[PDB]
Design a protein around this motif. Structure first.
Motif, PDB file in Angstrom:
ATOM      1  N   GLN A  96       0.796  -1.235   0.000  1.00 20.64           N
ATOM      2  CA  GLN A  96       0.000   0.000   0.000  1.00 20.64           C
ATOM      3  C   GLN A  96       0.816   1.266   0.000  1.00 20.64           C
ATOM      4  O   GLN A  96       0.238   2.383  -0.102  1.00 20.64           O
ATOM      5  N   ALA A  97       2.141   1.130   0.096  1.00 21.10           N
ATOM      6  CA  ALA A  97       3.013   2.287   0.032  1.00 21.10           C
ATOM      7  C   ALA A  97       4.164   2.103  -0.898  1.00 21.10           C
ATOM      8  O   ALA A  97       4.672   1.005  -1.043  1.00 21.10           O
ATOM      9  N   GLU A  98       4.599   3.209  -1.489  1.00 25.62           N
ATOM     10  CA  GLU A  98       5.829   3.255  -2.251  1.00 25.62           C
ATOM     11  C   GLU A  98       7.043   3.060  -1.349  1.00 25.62           C
ATOM     12  O   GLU A  98       7.714   2.022  -1.448  1.00 25.62           O
ATOM     13  N   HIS A  99       7.287   4.017  -0.440  1.00 25.59           N
ATOM     14  CA  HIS A  99       8.529   4.055   0.340  1.00 25.59           C
ATOM     15  C   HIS A  99       8.518   3.156   1.587  1.00 25.59           C
ATOM     16  O   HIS A  99       7.536   3.061   2.348  1.00 25.59           O
ATOM     17  N   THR A 102       7.350   4.936   4.840  1.00 25.01           N
ATOM     18  CA  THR A 102       5.935   5.032   4.947  1.00 25.01           C
ATOM     19  C   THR A 102       5.376   3.710   5.452  1.00 25.01           C
ATOM     20  O   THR A 102       4.538   3.712   6.345  1.00 25.01           O
TER      21      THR A 102
ATOM     22  N   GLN B  39       3.911  15.980   0.874  1.00 22.62           N
ATOM     23  CA  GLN B  39       4.531  14.681   1.260  1.00 22.62           C
ATOM     24  C   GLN B  39       5.191  14.653   2.649  1.00 22.62           C
ATOM     25  O   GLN B  39       5.050  13.717   3.400  1.00 22.62           O
ATOM     26  N   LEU B  46       1.498  10.940   9.712  1.00 23.30           N
ATOM     27  CA  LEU B  46       1.578   9.487  10.002  1.00 23.30           C
ATOM     28  C   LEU B  46       2.354   9.189  11.307  1.00 23.30           C
ATOM     29  O   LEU B  46       1.952   8.350  12.157  1.00 23.30           O
ATOM     30  N   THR B  68      -3.757  16.058  -2.270  1.00 23.19           N
ATOM     31  CA  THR B  68      -4.315  14.745  -2.293  1.00 23.19           C
ATOM     32  C   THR B  68      -3.629  13.836  -1.263  1.00 23.19           C
ATOM     33  O   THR B  68      -4.310  13.151  -0.480  1.00 23.19           O
ATOM     34  N   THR B  69      -2.297  13.924  -1.212  1.00 21.35           N
ATOM     35  CA  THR B  69      -1.506  13.010  -0.414  1.00 21.35           C
ATOM     36  C   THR B  69      -1.639  13.291   1.086  1.00 21.35           C
ATOM     37  O   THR B  69      -1.715  12.351   1.877  1.00 21.35           O
ATOM     38  N   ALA B  72      -5.026  11.809   1.986  1.00 23.19           N
ATOM     39  CA  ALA B  72      -5.011  10.384   1.984  1.00 23.19           C
ATOM     40  C   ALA B  72      -4.474   9.960   3.351  1.00 23.19           C
ATOM     41  O   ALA B  72      -5.055   9.090   4.000  1.00 23.19           O
ATOM     42  N   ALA B  73      -3.437  10.647   3.846  1.00 21.80           N
ATOM     43  CA  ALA B  73      -2.879  10.290   5.142  1.00 21.80           C
ATOM     44  C   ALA B  73      -3.871  10.471   6.252  1.00 21.80           C
ATOM     45  O   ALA B  73      -3.933   9.633   7.152  1.00 21.80           O
ATOM     46  N   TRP B  76      -6.391   7.553   6.092  1.00 24.11           N
ATOM     47  CA  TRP B  76      -5.864   6.302   6.639  1.00 24.11           C
ATOM     48  C   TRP B  76      -5.720   6.355   8.156  1.00 24.11           C
ATOM     49  O   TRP B  76      -6.028   5.384   8.815  1.00 24.11           O
TER      50      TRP B  76
HETATM   51  C1  LIG Z   1       4.801   9.265  -2.227  1.00 23.65           C
HETATM   52  C2  LIG Z   1       3.437   8.988  -1.651  1.00 23.65           C
HETATM   53  S1  LIG Z   1       2.111   9.560  -2.596  1.00 23.65           S
HETATM   54  C3  LIG Z   1       0.876   8.961  -1.503  1.00 23.65           C
HETATM   55  C4  LIG Z   1      -0.505   9.199  -1.914  1.00 23.65           C
HETATM   56  C5  LIG Z   1      -1.540   8.289  -1.631  1.00 23.65           C
HETATM   57  C6  LIG Z   1      -2.836   8.535  -2.084  1.00 23.65           C
HETATM   58  C7  LIG Z   1      -3.033   9.708  -2.807  1.00 23.65           C
HETATM   59  C8  LIG Z   1      -1.942  10.560  -3.067  1.00 23.65           C
HETATM   60  N1  LIG Z   1      -0.699  10.295  -2.652  1.00 23.65           N
HETATM   61  C9  LIG Z   1       1.461   8.315  -0.338  1.00 23.65           C
HETATM   62  C10 LIG Z   1       0.608   7.768   0.734  1.00 23.65           C
HETATM   63  C11 LIG Z   1      -0.101   8.579   1.541  1.00 23.65           C
HETATM   64  C12 LIG Z   1      -1.156   7.945   2.439  1.00 23.65           C
HETATM   65  C13 LIG Z   1      -0.599   6.738   3.147  1.00 23.65           C
HETATM   66  C14 LIG Z   1      -1.706   6.033   3.921  1.00 23.65           C
HETATM   67  C15 LIG Z   1       0.401   7.303   4.139  1.00 23.65           C
HETATM   68  C16 LIG Z   1       0.107   5.746   2.248  1.00 23.65           C
HETATM   69  C17 LIG Z   1       0.491   6.265   0.858  1.00 23.65           C
HETATM   70  C18 LIG Z   1       2.940   8.319  -0.400  1.00 23.65           C
HETATM   71  C19 LIG Z   1       3.808   7.749   0.606  1.00 23.65           C
HETATM   72  O1  LIG Z   1       4.891   8.642   0.888  1.00 23.65           O
HETATM   73  C20 LIG Z   1       4.608   9.816   1.644  1.00 23.65           C
HETATM   74  C21 LIG Z   1       3.857   9.492   2.930  1.00 23.65           C
HETATM   75  C22 LIG Z   1       5.988  10.436   1.918  1.00 23.65           C
HETATM   76  C23 LIG Z   1       3.779  10.797   0.824  1.00 23.65           C
HETATM   77  C24 LIG Z   1       4.414   6.465   0.106  1.00 23.65           C
HETATM   78  O2  LIG Z   1       5.487   6.067   0.523  1.00 23.65           O
HETATM   79  O3  LIG Z   1       3.774   5.737  -0.778  1.00 23.65           O
END
Ligand SMILES: Cc1sc(-c2ccccn2)c(C2=CCC(C)(C)CC2)c1[C@H](OC(C)(C)C)C(=O)O
Ligand SMILES: Cc1sc(-c2ccccn2)c(C2=CCC(C)(C)CC2)c1[C@H](OC(C)(C)C)C(=O)O
Ligand SMILES: [Mg+2]
Ligand SMILES: [Mg+2]
Lengths: 131, 131
Positions: A96-99, A102, B39, B46, B68-69, B72-73, B76
């Motif tokens: 559910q996550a890229e990094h 996270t 981000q 988180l 958006t991001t 999303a956090a 969640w």
């Molecule tokens: C690099 C990104 S983009 C992104 C996201 C998710 C939905 C909509 C827009 N961006 C996310 C997420 C945000 C919400 C969650 C629950 C923490 C998990 C995924 C991420 C997230 O990195 C951040 C937290 C540094 C931005 C990741 O590693 O995927």
């Protein structure tokens, strides 16, 4: 005792995860760092010491606390001297996550909020009661 | 209410300091980040959500939570929507550290441990009492 924490590094996907456990509660805090380093250890401990009443710190690798800069941090903060559970939760949410960082923070949240009161609750209560 | 936090960015020496305040206690957590970013905001939240029971979050710049991001956090984690004091303490200890981030963490520690019970105590007590 409520001031005892355990601090260790684990490896996953070629990165390092610093994990701190509040032994009495099972509460954890964790951070992803490039590599095991006295400076990283030091700075994490500053951060930890600033949110909780940290009295003593144990580790599984005594050499981790050997550096001058880690000792200086423990001095200033007044400090003296779960991989599998957390690693499990990271696998479940890795999708559910890229990094990695996270996914770590998601797992740490999953860990501290789960009930059997949750770890997150038990730390607060233990520390409040001891005030 | 014990679930309300305030979250803002401030600037110092060309870097960005994300500051979170637990409004009921005056407890703070803070982090140095390269620049204001959705981000960075997201990832901090988180981390925050994983240690405390964060219900709502206020800010002084509504546009901070627009991305958006960040939404999303908050989704969640189940979240809904002091610069001068801290800046002061950073000046007093700036001399004793090389990196700004280290001076921040030193000040945050100074802030949370000071008595008038300390901020660090009041958060724990407030949250324990509300369990
Ligand atoms: C690099 C990104 S983009 C992104 C996201 C998710 C939905 C909509 C827009 N961006 C996310 C997420 C945000 C919400 C969650 C629950 C923490 C998990 C995924 C991420 C997230 O990195 C951040 C937290 C540094 C931005 C990741 O590693 O995927
Ligand atoms: C880059 C360094 S080296 C170093 C240090 C201090 C004394 C002995 C050895 N190293 C320190 C300090 C450690 C103890 C304190 C109280 C946190 C403040 C100064 C630092 C410190 O950065 C770290 C925390 C990432 C290592 C700094 O920004 O000066
Ligand atoms: Mg990555
Ligand atoms: Mg610097």
């Amino acid at each position: 005792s409520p001031g005892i924490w355990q601090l260790d590094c684990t490896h996953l996907e070629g990165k390092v995860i610093l994990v701190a456990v509040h032994v009495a509660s099972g509460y954890i805090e964790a951070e992803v760092i490039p590599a095991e380093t006295g400076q990283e250890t030091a700075y994490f401990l500053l951060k930890l010491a600033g949110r909780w009443p940290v009295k003593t710190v144990h580790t599984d690798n005594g050499s981790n606390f050997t550096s001058t800069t880690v000792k200086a941090a423990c001095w200033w903060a007044g400090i003296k001297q779960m991989n599998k559970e957390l690693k499990k939760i990271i696998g479940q949410v890795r999708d559910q996550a890229e990094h990695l960082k996270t996914a770590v923070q998601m797992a740490v949240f999953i860990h501290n909020k789960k009930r059997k009161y949750s770890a997150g609750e038990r730390i607060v209560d233990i520390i409040a009661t001891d005030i």
